[PDB]
Amino acid sequence: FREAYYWLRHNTPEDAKVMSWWDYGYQITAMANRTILVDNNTWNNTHISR
Amino acid sequence: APPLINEDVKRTVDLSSHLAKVTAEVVLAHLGGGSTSRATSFLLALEPELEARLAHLGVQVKGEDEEENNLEVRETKIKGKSGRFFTVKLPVALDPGAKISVIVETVYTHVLHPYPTQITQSEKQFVVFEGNHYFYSPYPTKTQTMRVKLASRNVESYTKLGNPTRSEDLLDYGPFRDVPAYSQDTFKVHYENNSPFLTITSMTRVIEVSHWGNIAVEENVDLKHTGAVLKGPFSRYDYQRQPDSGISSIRSFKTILPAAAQDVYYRDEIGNVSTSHLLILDDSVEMEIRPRFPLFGGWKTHYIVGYNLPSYEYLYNLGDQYALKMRFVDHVFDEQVIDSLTVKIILPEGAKNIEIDSPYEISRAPDELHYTYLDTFGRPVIVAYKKNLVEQHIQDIVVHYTFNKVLMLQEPLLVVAAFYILFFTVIIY
Amino acid sequence: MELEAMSRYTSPVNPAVFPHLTVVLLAIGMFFTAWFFVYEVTSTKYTRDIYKELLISLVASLFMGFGVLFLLLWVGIYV
Amino acid sequence: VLHFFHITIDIRNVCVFLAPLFSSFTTIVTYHLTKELKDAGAGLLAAAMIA
Amino acid sequence: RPPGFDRVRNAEIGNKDFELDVLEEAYTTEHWLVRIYKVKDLDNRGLSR
Ligand SMILES: *[C@@H]1O[C@H](CO)[C@@H](O[C@@H]2O[C@H](CO)[C@@H](O[C@@H]3O[C@H](CO[C@H]4O[C@H](CO[C@H]5O[C@H](CO)[C@@H](O)[C@H](O)[C@@H]5O)[C@@H](O)[C@H](O[C@H]5O[C@H](CO)[C@@H](O)[C@H](O)[C@@H]5O)[C@@H]4O)[C@@H](O)[C@H](O[C@H]4O[C@H](CO)[C@@H](O)[C@H](O)[C@@H]4O[C@H]4O[C@H](CO)[C@@H](O)[C@H](O)[C@@H]4O)[C@@H]3O)[C@H](O)[C@H]2NC(C)=O)[C@H](O)[C@H]1NC(C)=O
Ligand SMILES: *[C@@H]1O[C@H](CO)[C@@H](O[C@@H]2O[C@H](CO)[C@@H](O)[C@H](O)[C@H]2NC(C)=O)[C@H](O)[C@H]1NC(C)=O
């Protein structure tokens, strides 16, 4: 889990957007330091459904 | 000035790895007659193309006493002539009609360029090297030869000036004769090179010495793979299944730590790393470090390693005077290249008369003041910088300072007061 | 004034000593500290004497405070 | 506060160990609340169970 | 068990061979726990992908 995050951290453009299920939104942002589309708080249902 | 000539030159060029080592054995001779003064020193010249990339230069006389045969070399500028020059002081003056044999060693960095720039997982790695056929010197050379050692025998192309013989992975050039001084001919070779192209972009070395019998060192390492850039997707399945896959890729490297190193820890910004294997040899503590993911061209990683050492191994004292000897930098790996190294030494608070006997030139920044556990006055910090360091620069440095015994007893007193005041507050309440 | 010419230094307290000192010093500090609190809570306006309280508090602080330092070194957080 | 006294601790350590410390504080609160309802003897039992 | 078996579902995958037209494999972990794919760009020649 950490190994993938570290790989993204240094091997991808800083402005890259990563798509994943909402479960992992917090972990990716904290360690990968890359933008995410969905997050655990799930404040927008329509965004998650899309 | 006395007229000197290069009676014989033999050049060996090593291109096996990402660094180009050059050794030239020159039998210097004095051409001047009795009227000319005895020559105590001789000049060395750098080609303009490679002068920027010269990591290190060493000269030693050809003799059994190699330890004592090393000659002092100083950077000098000769008027009217472009390029860097070095002045070498001979052990004994060279009188007219005499000759001496000296060995010159130079190391250049970044001189091998991947061609093609981009390769896929299956494709191999090829590099281009550009040198000189002739020994570039202020003095004429009577005759010279070159021997070039390639990383692999699969040499794609090379310059055939002088009908060089090619056997196995070795090339022979010359013998050239009557070469004028300052002569240049561009030697170009393109060949397969699969050696690990690892560059340490920056490293920070922090040394903390504590009066309680312990010194702790932590090194922050930033590593980048400077080989041909990977092209196309990375197949995990292919990489595991086939040995040949990603042959250029680097899997692991080994660091030779100090013999006394204790409590060695390997970690990263995001937590610990459990892949490193530690082996304790009698002479040194071998550490095998494996990065979290294999490094292909253009990839990078960061890691931090630290360890503790006993005081008596490296610390020395004479009453109030304390002098500590430390190796300047760790042996991270063979053929290591460091673009920027910063060394910080944190002495105990209250140190006075701090002096540093640098082995060689290093920029020194103003000393900082550091606060850590129990510090009120503050611990003095020594700061230094250098660039383009290579393996040859693993020398020894000594620092001298004065300290007093009473200061150690100060440490308990501060701690006791905080507890006592709490009792007093209860009484008042 | 060079390393070979000069001597070498080590902490006077050897590493093996540290575990024993930390345990002994802390235990003495704890006993006095408990005595101080129990005496204060039980005591009343007419039963308390400043002189007794100061002596117990000072002794407790000294023993425990040194003990804490040995604990930090034993843990390995060298000052 | 810890940095103010020159005790340099990582922020990460503070968060990791924040939770165990409060559990001890909760134990003290439990004893007093139980003592109010019935007696001290009940409160000591409650503190042991909650811990 | 035969190749292509999925241990956690205890079943063998029906569809074993297929290719990704719009996605490419960027990185996969040693145990395959996390798989990363990169989004392919549009077609240079405008052909329907
Ligand atoms: C936080 O991160 C840190 C850092 O990662 C974690 O600590 C680290 O944890 C790892 C866990 O593996 C420890 O690894 C240990 O490494 C040493 C060194 O390994 C190298 O040298 C070995 C020496 O072998 C010599 O002799 C043989 C012939 O006998 C020769 O072939 C060799 O060349 C040497 O001369 C060597 O055996 C190792 O080879 C192995 O690995 C390489 C690839 O690395 C392979 O090619 C080899 O085939 C082989 O697999 C290697 O070169 C090892 O000695 C340790 O092995 C012991 O412990 C293993 C478990 O960790 C266990 O599997 C082994 O069998 C062995 O078992 C030991 O203990 C047993 C009792 O429990 C005994 O029965 C047994 O005899 C033996 O004593 C081990 O792999 C790191 O040392 C450690 N690093 C540090 C700095 O502490 C930390 O845990 C992390 N914290 C977390 C996650 O919370
Ligand atoms: C996480 O990513 C952010 C986003 O870029 C990084 O912020 C950059 O930080 C560097 C170094 O201070 C600045 O030069 C850039 O201008 C910053 N960019 C932006 C867009 O703010 C941040 O450094 C990363 N976090 C780390 C490395 O811990």
As a three-state string, the secondary structure of chain E is CCCCEECCCCEECCCCCCCCCCEEEEEECCCCCCEEEEECCCCCCCCCC
To the nearest whole Å, the CA of E40 is away from the closest chain B CA by 11
What torsion, rounded to 10 degrees, do the Cα atoms B168, B170, B175, B180 define? 150
In the block, which residue shows the tokens 């013998």?
B175
Structure tokens at B5: 């000539």
State if residue A20 touches ligand 2 by the CB under 6 angstroms criterion: no
Q: Which helix (H) or strand (E) holds B175?
A: strand B170-179
Angle, to 10 degrees, between the axis of helix B406-428 and the axis of helix C17-42?
20
Prior bond of B116 cis (ω within 30°): yes
Give residue limits of the domains in chain B. 2-193, 194-403, 404-429
Q: Where are the beta strands (DSSP E) in B281-422?
A: 285-289, 300-310, 315-318, 321-327, 337-346, 352-357, 363-370, 379-390, 396-402
Q: With contact defined as beta carbons under 8 Å apart, do B78 and B59 qualify?
A: no
Q: If you measure from the C-alpha of residue A15 to the centroid of ligand 2, how many angstroms do you get, rounded to a whole number?
A: 11
Amino acid at E46: G
Chains that touch B (3 or more CB pairs under 8 A): A, C, D, E
Question: Position of tokens 């300047």?
Answer: B328
* Encoded tokens for B132: 């000189």
**CB-based contact B376 D8, cutoff 8 Å:** no
Any binding-site annotation on A5?
A: no
In this structure, are residues E37 and E24 in contact, taking their beta carbons and an 8 Å threshold? yes
Is C28 within 8 Å of chain B by CB? Answer: no
- Chain-centroid distance, C-alpha B226: 17
Asked if C64 contacts C19 with a C-beta cutoff of 8 angstroms, the reply is no
Secondary structure string (H, E, C) spanning C2-42: CCCCCECCCCCCCCCHHHHHHHHHHHHHHHHHHHHHHHHHH
CA of A32 to the centre of ligand 2 (A): 12
A4 closest CA partner among E31, E6, B248: E31
Mutation target for B interface from E16, E30, E40: give the one with most B CBs within 10 A. Answer: E30
Contact partners for chain A, using 3 or more CB pairs closer than 8 A, are: B, E
Give the residue on B whose Cα is nearest the Cα of A30.
Answer: B270
Within 10 angstroms of residue B131's Cβ, the number of other Cβ atoms is 22
Residue having the nearest C-alpha atom to atom 21 of ligand 1: B279
* Chain B interface mutation, best of E24, E25, E34, highest count of B Cβ atoms under 10 Å: E25
Q: How far apart are CA B263 and CA B242, in angstroms?
A: 37
Strand B396-402: give its sheet, edge to edge: B315-318, B321-327, B396-402, B352-357
Q: D18-37 vs D40-50: helix axis angle to the nearest 10?
A: 150
- Closest to B355 measured CA to CA, from C36, C1, D51: C1
B274 lines ligand 1 (CB under 6 A): yes
| Ligand 1 pocket check for B93: Cβ under 6 Å | no
Are the beta carbons of B200 and B336 closer than 8 angstroms?
A: yes
For residue B233, the CA-to-ligand 2 centroid distance in Å is 27
Which three-class secondary structure state does DSSP give residue B159?
Answer: coil
Burial of B301 (0-12, 13-18, 19+ CB in 10 A): buried
User: What resolution in angstroms does the PDB record give?
Assistant: 4.1
Query: Which stretches of B70-149 are assigned E, i.e. beta strand?
Result: 73-76, 85-94, 99-109, 112-114, 118-119, 126-132, 141-149
Tallying the residues shown for chain C, one arrives at 79
| Distance of alpha carbon E11 from alpha carbon B182, whole angstroms | 76
Experimental method: cryo-EM
- Measured between its terminal Cα atoms, the distance across chain D in Å is 27
Stated as kind and residue range, the H or E segment containing B428 is: helix B406-428
Cis ω before B175 (30° cut-off from 0)? yes
User: Measuring CA to CA, how many Å separate B264 from each of B218, B258, C15, D43?
Assistant: 10, 11, 19, 48
Q: How many residues does chain A have?
A: 50
CA distance B135 to B146: 9
Residue B263 gets the label, from left (phi > 0), alpha (psi -120 to 50) or beta, of left
Nearest CA to ligand 1 atom 42: B277
CA distance B309 to B245: 41
